[PDB]
Structures are given as structure tokens and as C-alpha cells.
Design a protein around this nucleic acid. Sequence first.
RNA 1: AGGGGAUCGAAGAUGAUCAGAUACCGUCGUAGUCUUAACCAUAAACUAUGCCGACUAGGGAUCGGGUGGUGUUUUUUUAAUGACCCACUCGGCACCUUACGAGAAAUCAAAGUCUUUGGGUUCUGGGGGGAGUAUGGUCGCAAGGCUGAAACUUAAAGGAAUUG
RNA 2: GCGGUAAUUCCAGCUCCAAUAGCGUAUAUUAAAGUUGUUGCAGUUAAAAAGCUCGUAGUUGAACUUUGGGCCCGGUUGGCCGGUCGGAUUUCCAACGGGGCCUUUCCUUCUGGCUAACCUUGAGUCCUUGUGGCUCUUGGCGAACCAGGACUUUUACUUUGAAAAAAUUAGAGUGUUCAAAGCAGGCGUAUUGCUCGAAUAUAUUAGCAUGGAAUAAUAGAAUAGGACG
RNA 3: GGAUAGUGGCCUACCAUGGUUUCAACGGGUAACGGGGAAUAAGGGUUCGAUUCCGGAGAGGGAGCCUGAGAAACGGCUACCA
Lengths: 129, 155, 150, 144, 81, 87
Amino acid sequence: TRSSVLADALNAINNAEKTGKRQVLIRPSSKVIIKFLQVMQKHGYIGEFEYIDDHRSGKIVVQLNGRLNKCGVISPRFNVKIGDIEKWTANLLPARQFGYVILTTSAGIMDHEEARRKHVSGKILGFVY
Amino acid sequence: STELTVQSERAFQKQPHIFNNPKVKTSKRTKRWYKNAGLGFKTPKTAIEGSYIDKKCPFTGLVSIRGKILTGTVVSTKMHRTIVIRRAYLHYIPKYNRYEKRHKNVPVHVSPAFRVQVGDIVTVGQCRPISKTVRFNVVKVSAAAGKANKQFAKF
Amino acid sequence: GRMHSAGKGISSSAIPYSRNAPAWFKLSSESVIEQIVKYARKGLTPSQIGVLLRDAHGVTQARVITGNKIMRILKSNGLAPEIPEDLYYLIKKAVSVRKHLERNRKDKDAKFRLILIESRIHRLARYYRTVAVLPPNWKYESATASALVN
Amino acid sequence: GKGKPRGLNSARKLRVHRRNNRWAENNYKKRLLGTAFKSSPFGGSSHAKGIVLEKLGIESKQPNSAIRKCVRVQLIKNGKKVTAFVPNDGCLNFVDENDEVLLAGFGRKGKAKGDIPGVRFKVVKVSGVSLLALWKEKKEKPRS
Amino acid sequence: VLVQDLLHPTAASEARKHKLKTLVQGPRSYFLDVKCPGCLNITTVFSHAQTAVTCESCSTILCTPTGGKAKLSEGTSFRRK
Amino acid sequence: MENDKGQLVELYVPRKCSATNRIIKADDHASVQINVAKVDEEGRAIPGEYVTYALSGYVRSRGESDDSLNRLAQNDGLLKNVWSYSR
RNA sequence: AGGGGAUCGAAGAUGAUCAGAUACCGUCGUAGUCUUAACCAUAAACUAUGCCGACUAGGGAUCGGGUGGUGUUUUUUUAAUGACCCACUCGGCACCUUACGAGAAAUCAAAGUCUUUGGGUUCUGGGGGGAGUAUGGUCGCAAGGCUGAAACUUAAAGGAAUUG
RNA sequence: GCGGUAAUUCCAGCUCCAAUAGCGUAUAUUAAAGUUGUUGCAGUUAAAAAGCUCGUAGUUGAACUUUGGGCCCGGUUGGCCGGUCGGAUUUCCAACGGGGCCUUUCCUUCUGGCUAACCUUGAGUCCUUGUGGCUCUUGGCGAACCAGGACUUUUACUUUGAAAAAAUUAGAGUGUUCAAAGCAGGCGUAUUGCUCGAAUAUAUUAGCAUGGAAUAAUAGAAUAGGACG
RNA sequence: GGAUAGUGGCCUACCAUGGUUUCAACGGGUAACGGGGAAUAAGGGUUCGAUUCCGGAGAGGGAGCCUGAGAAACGGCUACCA
Ligand SMILES: [Mg+2]
Ligand SMILES: [Mg+2]
Ligand SMILES: [Mg+2]
Ligand SMILES: [Mg+2]
Ligand SMILES: [Mg+2]
Ligand SMILES: [Mg+2]
Ligand SMILES: [Mg+2]
Ligand SMILES: [Mg+2]
Ligand SMILES: [Mg+2]
Ligand SMILES: [Mg+2]
Ligand SMILES: [Mg+2]
Ligand SMILES: [Mg+2]
Ligand SMILES: [Mg+2]
Ligand SMILES: [Mg+2]
Ligand SMILES: [Mg+2]
Ligand SMILES: [Mg+2]
Ligand SMILES: [Mg+2]
Ligand SMILES: [Mg+2]
Ligand SMILES: [Mg+2]
Ligand SMILES: [Mg+2]
Ligand SMILES: [Mg+2]
Ligand SMILES: [Mg+2]
Ligand SMILES: [Mg+2]
Ligand SMILES: [Mg+2]
Ligand SMILES: [Mg+2]
Ligand SMILES: [Mg+2]
Ligand SMILES: [Mg+2]
Ligand SMILES: [Mg+2]
Ligand SMILES: [Mg+2]
Ligand SMILES: [Mg+2]
Ligand SMILES: [Mg+2]
Ligand SMILES: [Mg+2]
Ligand SMILES: [Mg+2]
Ligand SMILES: [Mg+2]
Ligand SMILES: [Mg+2]
Ligand SMILES: [Mg+2]
Ligand SMILES: [Mg+2]
Ligand SMILES: [Mg+2]
Ligand SMILES: [Mg+2]
Ligand SMILES: [Mg+2]
Ligand SMILES: [Mg+2]
Ligand SMILES: [Zn+2]
């Protein structure tokens, strides 16, 4: 049964990009997806997106360019001890100078750099490079 | 647990040193003692209203509460005047960097100031050893009855 | 999905975006809440009623013209069954299947469906049991299932 | 996501599953079964002393043709009997029966050396001295 | 393909889709007012009725149940809304 | 790809598909670059002067060179209807 | 344990062939084959390919349901019908062409979306023999089923593809 | 894998190589091992999907509930100046953080004790044509937390901090002649003394303490036995 | 209630029927004293800790006790076993 709604949305984004397309339809969206969707965009990894509004759980259409190779999800939202964040970035980001690990903290969903500057931690959500 | 009688024993039950002068004709028969365990726990009126005896009551007896204050879920009430709670908790194996469900039962005394049934979340307090196992005493019900009366007959 | 089979059949209703109106629908909550009850009173299941209102009358979505789900009209007017009707119908089937099994011991296939049907009952029973609508300790047994239905 | 539980509470399973699977590891099993202490002619020790019962002439395995000079030894701490190789040209002329000798492993982790079938050990010293030393000329084999 | 509007699908290709795979999903049935001109007043009917919808005043008939769409009776007329 | 102080370091900044904006590498010998002519007053085509498009070997192999050209030329000014953004 | 016992036919006896021929081929033919009431629980029980969910690509057939159509045919007087035709749509058993991709390959729309390695969950393997052997437990009337080791030996065994 | 007669493997002589006051060998274990796999394996044919379905434990489990906008104070990096006799701060500027507001908006709560803060203001004003600026009592801020009562749906996570043994480890300082070490030492009036040290970090699971309120659970009002008065 | 320095099934008497368990109780094994730590260096891990410091246990095996603030002591005693 539908297991991590984020997972599907992330994965779908990736498959359109890899097959050279410029838009996805994703189903079914969620707070978290948007708040994620929103982080990528803030850093150019996608264009704009429309919440279309079935009277249900929602849909989104993302507009993506090509600056994007992978945007994956970390499937159990593990815990990170603000020390540990270097360990995550180091393990799944291509170089120590671009790409973000976005995560989930008391002070909001936010990539690791922002999460570094605000000095908070929490659970780890996904990544973008 | 108690329920009924109060003088159900071979030894006459009484609160130690709480004399009632038979010479002085009074209305309350027995003078009764009580206290508050402190730490902010209200002493239930059933402790002050009651006439049960219990030297292991934290409000009407000779125990003290000092040390761990824990909460757990009631899972057995077959013992007279004492219960067993289960304290569940998760346990962090590193290496796999996740947790597994664990628990422990904890035997605890229970003053007939409270009426506890199974399923009630309860707050207990640390005790001088009270019995072989028991090192804790029920000290508030953070529950009620788990909506039993909204399980009734038919329309 | 598809619980006791490998069916993959997406068939369903597609409810409209229009959560109100139909505007071309005159009448009134008045008229229709009453409509529900008289049928409930006949003896029909809310489902049978929702249908016998969808066709004969204009009741597109009974929750809409009357801000309530049909089973809540029924309970509120004290017309609500001992046990929920999905459960009612599972049990009713298990009985009849059982009755066939007793007259046909040689029919292993039927024994197999009984299990299935009963297994669904038992899960469902537990749900309702979890959420107050059945008493704790409500139980289904063949021995006493026949009485439940008729 | 084939296989392992990925959940955040699935720790217990994940360990037990590992536990259960190291047993297929050939020397994880050896270690906790105490195959040293239990089987193995030596204790679980580096060497063992023993006594030469008889001098043998084990014929080599194919495709080699040769007679490999070997001694049957009776381990002192054991009476466990064990046949052992006597390395280098001659050297079998250094042993004689009833002598005490120092056995040692062959460095194949149990397992026969090469074309010597059955022999899992080699001689290191006799009557307290060392073949090697005897072999050269550096030292001489003691009296009686 | 490769680049398009998913936000504004053409009328007739959304049309031909499945009722759950349209942009926002909705029904594709409809209601009608039917009459068998023996009686004067006219009843409301569902395009997919299941129930063989009797008429208001007489026990005539109207439409029978089918696979899906109800099959109406000989001499009647209708209209959507 | 600068460095400590200004200074454009490391060679070769590469082309890009005009349809997917992915990099067009060397061995991408399936890719393409299409020079379409700049015309002037009364037929005639100003030579030397082009509107230029580059398309990834991927895109071509995936059969989308033609459609993805229709869309590009059009919304740059050299097609009149032909293409549609709706399906 | 009854019944049935046409057929074909483990066993057995034969004719032949053969150096031999306990076989292959030919004859006889016990049990069996069928059925009831009980057992047994195993097959290369196979797609040698867990289940649920998402996504990624072209094509023509077909099976079931459906919606559309001043389609064809049935003539009666025109319909109603029924069967056929064409477009679509779900859900089936499959085939075709591809290669984005995958793989040691053979090949594979999953065996794809994995060092750019995390949706959920179950189960099994960890060199070859020894060996599914020994031992205990357990189930069975039996035959046997399930669970299931070691010592010791050994440099390979194995898989796909190529040339011979 | 060599040796069955010209042995590049044996037995030697010569010569040569590697490490060198040290260098073989045996056993164990660790790395190599993504051959135990959380990170990170494999299972069509190489070892491996239980004949099949049900199902308890266990793990897992769709979306949705204060968002968006407005003003306020005050921090730290960095620039362009340097006022100054290496570093200084004001205004100018970015940018990144923290805090308190008002937007229909519990802050658990009433009862004083307290006030630190302006809607105050009471005069006016150092001084750039004045909201640039603070001393300043007489109507008008809560919460900053005392202490006394009366009461609080449960948790996971995460931050910061306490409470902490030394040697060990990481690491600062010091030229044990070097170094391993050690915790010394270093200046002079070297005839009656001057002096720097003996840091720092890690110390997690648990228990304690404080910030956050995303993510994920829990509880709530439906036979109203609801909530406020 | 007795006993203890004192809580306490620690022991006794009366009374009751409880306590633990697939979140692995109970039992078996350990060539098991626990820690500080040690070895192996991307990380995650793997293995080791009799042994310089802390804690515990012992004094051939058991049990018992005297003295004393403190021992169930062993370079104290008493008894049995070796
Ligand atoms: Mg009892
Ligand atoms: Mg299922
Ligand atoms: Mg489906
Ligand atoms: Mg259906
Ligand atoms: Mg095995
Ligand atoms: Mg022999
Ligand atoms: Mg011995
Ligand atoms: Mg027969
Ligand atoms: Mg025969
Ligand atoms: Mg013959
Ligand atoms: Mg025979
Ligand atoms: Mg089998
Ligand atoms: Mg087959
Ligand atoms: Mg297809
Ligand atoms: Mg054997
Ligand atoms: Mg060989
Ligand atoms: Mg020669
Ligand atoms: Mg030579
Ligand atoms: Mg030589
Ligand atoms: Mg060396
Ligand atoms: Mg991990
Ligand atoms: Mg492998
Ligand atoms: Mg195989
Ligand atoms: Mg299978
Ligand atoms: Mg099973
Ligand atoms: Mg959720
Ligand atoms: Mg901390
Ligand atoms: Mg230190
Ligand atoms: Mg007692
Ligand atoms: Mg009992
Ligand atoms: Mg276990
Ligand atoms: Mg020991
Ligand atoms: Mg130690
Ligand atoms: Mg240890
Ligand atoms: Mg020892
Ligand atoms: Mg002692
Ligand atoms: Mg001794
Ligand atoms: Mg004894
Ligand atoms: Mg002693
Ligand atoms: Mg002594
Ligand atoms: Mg002593
Ligand atoms: Zn009529």
C-alpha cells in the first residue's frame, strides 16, 4: 500500500528528468512534499509547481529544467545529531561545495546548510544534487 | 484493594499513635491521620474520607516518596493491594542505528485511596522496599476507566 | 490492493468536485431526511436506501442535500442495527456458505472460502471492536452466528 | 525494496537475523563451538610436544612421485596420536624412536600441506635442540 | 511528448480518458426527467439506475437495469439536468 | 569554474542541449547543431547568419529531435502554428 | 477398510535378441489403475523468478465489462433486437519491435528507475565434498515428512558466452 | 607448481635482491571482506523464493487542523572607509542568524509581592534649520519569577547545559643533547630571588536540566454522562 | 510477629492466589571476574581486556564462629572432607 508519499513524488521527478521531460504530474502531494518541493526550487533544481486541487489529497505539476541529476529520499527518516550531519552529506553528496541534504527539524524542513546556520537538528528527509 | 470490613484481620487494625479518648464523646469515632506526599500530588479525598487502614498508603501511612517518579500502564490487578505495571520504552541499538521495542513490568503497591482497573496509565513513586519485589507506590491516576460506559446496550 | 484475492480492479465511484448544490435540485433537507427515515423504517439498509434515492429521486449524494451520512440519520433517529451492515452481510454469507459446507463435506473449495470470509469478519469485527461500536469481547462463532442474522 | 526490514524500529530483527547468519561463516562457527579446544590434536595452541612412536614413509600425492619422511608422534598433554613431517634433506636421520619432538602447524589452517596426505604438522625440534640447527651444523643432538 | 501542458489538457483527449484519470476526477453519468405521457408530471431518474424505477402514480415501468446505463421503456422522452 | 582569485580555471566550458539543457560531451557523436537561416527583405537568406539550436544525442535517439525542434523554432519566431503545448 | 476390478498395467513368469540381457521389443499378467470412508504431504508442486505500492516505451491482436456511433447485416412496414464493424476505457492470458536502462552473459518492460547505492515487508544462500548423512526432537500404520549438525577431506566445483 | 640427465624452484659455490640488531616460522585475530552487507551483498540459469493460500506475534502503514502579511529591538561575520598614534567604533551597505509584537490567536491559573519595559509626561533640551538623545516623579504593560493555593492527555526526536577519576586517546605549552618519555621549567643581583606552567577536547546509551514544536505516535464531543458561567 | 544495625518472604504464623514469558521467560553453554580501556586506521564496523587504576570475589574445599568500630578473617580459631 502507499508507503512514503514523498518517496513516490521524489522518484517521479527523477524519472521525467532522466527521460528528458520538462514536467511531472505527482500524486498525491502533502505538506511535506511541498516543503520539500519548495527547497529544491529555492536553489534552482526546479521551476514552479501548481497544486491542482481534486477534493481529495491533491496533485502537483512540477516544471523542471535539467540542472537536476538526482533528488532521493532517505527511507527511514533517521535521526541526526548535528555532529552527524557531515557524515550524511559526505556519504551521499558529490562534492563538499554543492548539493544539499534536506532534513526535518523543530525549526522546519530545511537543507543542511540552513540547518547548520540556524543551529538546529532532527530527522533526515532526503537530498538534492 | 481492601473493600469492606476494615477489621478483617487477627490483629486489630489501627493507625499508630492516633489515640481516641473514649471518655470524650465525639462524632467521628476514630481520629484519622493523613499527609500529602508532596512533589505536587494531590492527596485524594478518598484517603481523607476513607477509614481503610494500610500502613503502606503514601497519604495515610508510614511510607515516604523519594527518588524516581515513573509512569506506566496497568497490566495486572490480581494482587490484593498491589499491582503490576508495564513500562514500555524503545532501545537504541547503534550499529543498525535504530531501535527495538522493550519493556519491564514493575510491581507497585496501591492504596485503596485509588480504584484501579487494568489499562489505566498511572504515576508511581519511589518507596522504601515495601515487600520482596515492590519498590514503588501508586501516587496519582492520570487515567479514568478508558471509556467503558460508552460501551453499553442498544438504541 | 484486493484483500483475499489477486484482483487489481480499480472500479469505483467518482464523486464530483461539487460538494453542494445540484442547483437544478429543488426540494430540501426537510423532504429528504424524512425520505431516508421512512425507508429505514421499512427495513432497508442505508446502502439500499442511498440507491433507492439515487434513482427514483434526485438524491445525488445524501450527505450533500442533508449535511449527514445516511447511517448517521438512522442512528440519530434510533434506527441503527445491532451490528454494522458490512459486518452483518459478511456474517450472513458465512452462515449460508457454512450451511452448504455442512450439506457438502466433499466441497473443499467451500471450506476454503469460509475461512476467507470468516477471516474478514474477524478483522472487521476487531476494527469495530477497537472503536467502541461493538462491546469489548464481542465475538463471532458459527455455533451462534445463525441467530445473529435471522 | 528486496529483503532486510528497513524500518526505524526493526533493529531487533536486523540483529538476530545477523546472529543467525554468521553461523554460515566457517570460522565464526569454529570459534564459538571451540573446535580448537574440542577437536584439534593440539590444545588450541601454537605448538605441542610429543613422542616419536614410529618413522613413516608417506608416499606423496600425484602428480608428484616421492617418499615424504614423517614421524608418528604421541602428544604429551594428550596421547592424541599425530603423524608429522620432518623437513629438509636427511633430518629423518635426526629423529629415532621414543625421542621427544616439537610439532607445529603447517600454516594452511588445519589442512594438509601439499602432496603429503594426512600430515597437518611438522617437526621443529628434537631432544630439545631444533632440526634446523642440526641440519646446518650449528649444534649437536644430546647424549641419551 | 517530452514537453507539454499537464495543467490544460485538450477537451476531447481528457474526454476520452477514464473517469478516475481525468485531471480532477468526476462522474460521467447524469440525471434525467422522464415521462410516459399517460400521467402528466415527470420524475427524476439516474442514468445508471440498478432499480427498475417505477413511475410516480401508476405501477407502469420506466427503465430496466443493465450492465451500466438504464434501458428506458418504449414511449418516453428525457433531458439532462 | 574560477579559483582563489578571479581566474577562469580548467578548460572547456561545454555546449548544452537546447531542449534539455544537459551537457553535450565529446563522444556524444549522436548529438547535433542546427543552423537555421536568417532571411531578409523579399526571400533571400543573409548568409553567415543563423539562429542556432543544439540537441542531445539522447533526445535524437529517443525520437524527439523533430518535435522538440518544432517547439523551439516556433517560440523563437520561425514557425506559425504547427506545434501545440496542449495534448 | 469396503466396493469396483472394462482398460492399461510396478511385481513375477515367459518369447526373443545379446558375449551376457535380471533390460529395451513381444506374450501372460499380481498389485495398481476407478470409487467411498480415513491416511500420507511429497514433484523440475516451474515462470527454476515473494507479496503490496509508485514511476519509466512503442505496436498490432485477443478474452471479460462498459460508454460512444443519422456503422454493416438480419425484414415485416419500419423499428426492438441479435451477431458483425469502427473509436475509446478499465481489467485479463499473451505475443511483437525496441533500449532510455539492466546484466557475467543468455537475455529482461522487469531481471529497469543501485558506488548518483534507502517506499514497505516476508523468506532463503555465504567455496566444493562429507550430506540432507549422524544425532535428538517431532509427525506418520507404514513408507517416510519436518527440524538438522560435526569430524575429516579438498583447489577447485560451478554459470553464461566463444572458438574448436 | 618444480625434480624422470643440458633443474630459472631441490643440494651447493659464485653473484644478486628485501628488511637490518634484528629477521624466519607456528597459532590466533584485524585490515584486504560490499566473502555477514545499518552504511553495503547475493537468490531466472552460478549457493539461495516455503507447492499454495489464510493468519497471530513482529515490522510497516494515504492525505487534512496558524498559515500568509505587517511593524519593533538587539546581536556576528564582511565590506568601503579609519577617528587613531598592528587594531578602534559610529553612521552607508549588503548577507546570515536570535528575540518580542499586531494580525479572531493560553500565557494553565487566580491572590500580592517587583516591577524591566511605554500608550506615558513633567519640565525642556546638550546640540547639525529635529523624534538624531538620556538623566527624569504624580493617572496609565505583565509575567522577568518570587510563594501560597487551586489543576495539568500521553510520548518519540532534536538543541544546549549540568553532574562527572585518574593513567589511556586526541591535543596545547616546554628544545629530555634527539627521540620514546617527563611535567617540567624559565629569568636574573647566579652572596641570601624573580617568574610562566601543570591547558583543552572526547567522555554518546541511561538518569537529570533547558530551548525548539517540523517529522511520527497518543488522548478529546456522538445514546452528549460534552465545554465554558 | 520474630529476627536485623536497619528496610524487606529475611524467617514464622494465619490468609490469599499469585509472580515471569516469542519485546525470548525458564533452562544449557561459556577455553566469562565487570568496568577504565587494548588491537585493526576512509567511515560503518570486527576482535580482545587473567594482567600496573576503580569495583567485586577468594585464600586447598565446604560450613561454623571468637575478638572487634569493622571479619563470617584464614600469615584467627572450631568441625568435617582432601
Ligand atoms: Mg493475592
Ligand atoms: Mg494479504
Ligand atoms: Mg490498484
Ligand atoms: Mg466494482
Ligand atoms: Mg546450511
Ligand atoms: Mg600410522
Ligand atoms: Mg592435563
Ligand atoms: Mg485389475
Ligand atoms: Mg521381468
Ligand atoms: Mg532369457
Ligand atoms: Mg527382474
Ligand atoms: Mg520441495
Ligand atoms: Mg515448467
Ligand atoms: Mg505496453
Ligand atoms: Mg559422513
Ligand atoms: Mg593441482
Ligand atoms: Mg649439469
Ligand atoms: Mg644447475
Ligand atoms: Mg641456488
Ligand atoms: Mg616484517
Ligand atoms: Mg544507516
Ligand atoms: Mg556474494
Ligand atoms: Mg540453483
Ligand atoms: Mg516460488
Ligand atoms: Mg509457515
Ligand atoms: Mg502520515
Ligand atoms: Mg549532550
Ligand atoms: Mg586531561
Ligand atoms: Mg508480610
Ligand atoms: Mg498456584
Ligand atoms: Mg531469540
Ligand atoms: Mg572463570
Ligand atoms: Mg580486567
Ligand atoms: Mg568481555
Ligand atoms: Mg583463567
Ligand atoms: Mg575475604
Ligand atoms: Mg594452591
Ligand atoms: Mg556442597
Ligand atoms: Mg575463612
Ligand atoms: Mg600465606
Ligand atoms: Mg590476610
Ligand atoms: Zn406513469
